[PDB]
Amino acid sequence: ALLEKIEKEAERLLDKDEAKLLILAEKFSGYAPACLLALVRQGADSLSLLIALEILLKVLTPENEPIILLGLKAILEKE
Numbered sequence: 108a109l110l111e112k113i114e115k116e117a118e119r120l121l122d123k124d125e126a127k128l129l130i131l132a133e134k135f136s137g138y139a140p141a142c143l144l145a146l147v148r149q150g151a152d153s154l155s156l157l158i159a160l161e162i163l164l165k166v167l168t169p170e171n172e173p174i175i176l177l178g179l180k181a182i183l184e185k186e
Contacts, residue, residue, distance in 0.1 A: 109168075109170060110170050110171075113141045113144060116138075117141035117142070117145035117148065120141055120142060120145040121145050123145070125146065125149070125151050125152070128145060129155070129159060132162040132163065136166040137166075142159050142162070143156070143160065143163050143178050144177070146159050147178060147181040156178055156181060156182045157182060160175070160178050160182070
């Protein structure tokens with residue numbers, strides 16, 4: 108259920124600073140899944156994604172295991 112709402116709200120997060128999106132995940136843990144999704148849709152930097160990956164892991168629900176899959180795969184495209 109939430110897996111489809113974290114998809115929608117991240118579209119509303121697609122128009123924000125990468126740094127700001129990192130603080131949103133850090134301070135608002137419930138926004139962390141949508142942040143990482145919005146960060147890969149923006150195609151952010153590897154470090155930017157690794158930070159959001161951390162903020163998401165510490166509060167990771169099994170429904171966000173796909174959000175991890177895309178995150179890792181997007182991070183991989185670096186070297």
